[PDB]
Amino acid sequence: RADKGKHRIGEFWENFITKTYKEGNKGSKRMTPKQVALRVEAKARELKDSKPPNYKTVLRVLAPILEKQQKAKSIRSPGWRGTTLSVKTREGKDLSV
DNA sequence: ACGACAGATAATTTGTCACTGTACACTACGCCTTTTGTGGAGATGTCTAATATCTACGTTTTAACAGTGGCCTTATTAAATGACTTCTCAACCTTCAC
């Protein structure tokens, strides 16, 4: 279906969840989804919104973001091949070997 | 035929709640190296005014004596003394007296 992977909480909450997790993981802060959901609870109460998102949705919202943040650890480097070689000096001069 | 009305129906997400994997078990900003501009002596080099020394510059002063200049009256006659000069330095015979 056209709806697969798209949430029904809507554009405001999809942003607010992802906004809150994103600010909570810059610097050495390490705000995990549960603390975000606890913010979402606080936000709905002060927004007077009677139906805050459940923690399972918040974890499902961030699951692709978390996976994109994970993949960055794995990306492999091709390396040099064959006989021809050079080494990258900080002068910016590639010295052939 | 196809596709086109209103509604079925297989998804899709929202939300529950039993379950479990894991950290809490204190245990990084600290060990070590290098450069480096600032800083403290401390041997050494720098180089003058000045208070003489250290003779000479020569310049005064002395006395010795050398030369110029003024004065000094001149005559005669006598004396003493010392000298000089000149001249002289015979000899036989006769006569009258005892």
Tell me the C-alpha distance between A65 and A78, whole Å. 26
- Reference A6, options A40, A57, A53; nearest CA is A57
Strand B-proximal residues of A, range 41-70, CB below 7 A, are 51, 53-54, 56-57, 60
Q: How far is the CA of A57 from the C1' of B13 (A)?
A: 9
Measured in angstroms, the resolution is: 2.3
Contact A94, A88 (CB under 8 A): yes
Tell me the C-alpha distance between A15 and A18, whole Å. 5
Tell me the C-alpha distance between A66 and A73, whole Å. 12
Largest CA distance in chain A: 69
Contact A2, A46 (CB under 8 A): no
Tell me the C-alpha distance between A40 and A17, whole Å. 7
* Structural determination approach: cryo-EM
Closest nt to residue A8, judged CA to C1': B13
Q: How far is the CA of A7 from the C1' of B6 (A)?
A: 28
- Reference A13, options A60, A64, A81; nearest CA is A60
